[PDB]
Amino acid sequence: SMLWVGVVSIFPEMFRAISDYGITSRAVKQGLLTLTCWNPRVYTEDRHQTVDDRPFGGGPGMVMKIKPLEGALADARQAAGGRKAKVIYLSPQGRQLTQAGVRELAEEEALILIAGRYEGIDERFIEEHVDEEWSIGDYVLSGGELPAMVLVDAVTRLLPGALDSFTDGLLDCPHYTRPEVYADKRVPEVLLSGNHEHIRRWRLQQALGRTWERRADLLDSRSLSGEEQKLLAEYIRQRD
Amino acid sequence: SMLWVGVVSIFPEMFRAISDYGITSRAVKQGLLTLTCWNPRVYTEDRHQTVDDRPFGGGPGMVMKIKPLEGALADARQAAGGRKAKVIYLSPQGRQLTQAGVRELAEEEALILIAGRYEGIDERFIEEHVDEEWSIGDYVLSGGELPAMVLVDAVTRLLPGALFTDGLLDCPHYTRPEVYADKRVPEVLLSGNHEHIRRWRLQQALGRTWERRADLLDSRSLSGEEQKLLAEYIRQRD
Ligand SMILES: C[S@@+](CC[C@H](N)C(=O)[O-])C[C@H]1O[C@@H](n2cnc3c(N)ncnc32)[C@H](O)[C@@H]1O
Ligand SMILES: C[S@@+](CC[C@H](N)C(=O)[O-])C[C@H]1O[C@@H](n2cnc3c(N)ncnc32)[C@H](O)[C@@H]1O
């Protein structure tokens, strides 16, 4: 009940992937999350009018009509009640989702997600109704249902009582479990015979070095402390 | 047939979102894409089908046990047959997925995608078995299932007959009616001039990219025409 999510999508049953499995499923059961779907085809003027129509100016593919989406939105808005509802359109043209963005969206009382299909939705719907556009990344998907699900999953993790990378702006350290030896590779001895301060310094150093190796861009936008500059310089020199 | 995909996951039923819907479901039907699931819970040794284990060095959470993962991977590789399969682990620590990455992945004949759960998987498993690590973006999800599905959806779209190419954001889209609640479709699109439609679209694409994602333009080699249409878009707005 702490977070109310409404999804506008022509494939509402596709959302069983999050309503029936994982953290999102557990959060629904616990009442932390409320999830509802709104099929635009149930909001056409008459049952003989489809959700899509030919694009103006031509070109390959079809475009989603404004009235079905408008109908679906209005109905979802009514169901949200007395909650501050943010209307998100999932689009590659939107703001890139990051852990910082996830933390913000987690503060919202209610969210209404517009999952588009075909070649996109009519600009006039975006202008009039869409509050914020959001992208899950710089790649093209066939529809906005997996992006909407990616957002719901990321946000649900932050809900209190529902349960790290980018929490500190760094990649995570490697993880190890039983047995102590597997395929001739042994667990770093510090993880087996170390104190919490040894384990903390090895984890921060591994996180810094992995970020430096793979995602240097994450460092150019992060301030390295005295300790970190030294843990990092050491990682670089001891790499292999 | 064109592309074979093996998924290592403890929630294979989540993959109904791609096996039953869209281009992926169509590609399966048309035989362009083969989609299979390999559940580590089946490759267990106990009654309760334990797939997680405590982490070395303390801390909260659990790590995925190597043996159930190795088992599921082994069987996925056997089913891949004689196909050259690239083993990918979905994680926030991986190479960031972009359209250019999608095109690269679309050249592979087989993909085995490993979907993590909990706090992650054992690094020794990754160093030994994983060819490549891929992220869908700078955020943390509860599992690798949605990222694996995003990857397959993106790649399937590039399969022939399936249904950031320009390196720009796209132009707005308009459909019937001509006029809706005091808003009307740009007249250029209501005309039949295929050259004026093209020019207007390329300008709106250049313009939207300049306004929102100037980073995509800094890496782009703008043509003589493109530099003119973009300048025009900038000078002509409030
Ligand atoms: C073929 S696609 C996008 C086509 C094109 N970029 C456009 O909108 O002009 C149709 C739907 O997929 C969704 N989508 C595709 N990629 C996405 C992404 N990377 N992030 C969020 N949504 C995406 C959007 O909801 C869009 O309506
Ligand atoms: C809670 S996460 C683990 C995050 C953890 N900090 C780590 O060390 O990877 C569980 C699983 O989600 C998947 N995952 C989470 N975010 C992802 C992302 N942004 N890109 C690709 N996969 C992701 C991975 O398979 C990961 O093992």
What domains, with CATH codes, occur in chain A?
A: 1-164 (3.40.1280.10), 165-240 (1.10.1270.20)
The one-character DSSP state at A133 is: E
**Which of A157, A201, A203, A210 does the annotation list as catalytic?**
A157
Best mutation target, B140, B183, B220, to test chain A (most A CBs within 10 A): B140
Angle at B5 between CA B4 and CA B9, to 5 degrees: 160
Residue A86: both structure tokens together: 């943010």
Residue B67: both structure tokens together: 């043996």
CA distance B86 to B78: 13
Chain A residue with the nearest C-alpha to that of B93: A171
Q: Is the dihedral of CA A137, A141, A144, A147 positive or negative?
A: negative
Resolution limit, Å: 2.2
- Binding-site residues of A sit at 116, 136-141
For A175, the closest of B16, B55, B200 (CB atoms) is B55
For B136, the closest of A142, A150, A203 (CB atoms) is A150
Q: Any catalytic annotation for residue A122?
A: no
Q: B227 in contact with A at a CB cutoff of 8 Å? A: no
Going by C-alpha positions, the residue among A175, A129, A156 that lies closest to residue A5 is A156
Exp. method: X-ray
As beta bridge partners, residue A7 has A37, A113
CA separation (Å) from B97 to A196, B3, B84, B131, B133?
A: 35, 19, 21, 15, 10
Spatial contact of A171 and A211, defined as CB atoms under 8 Å apart: yes
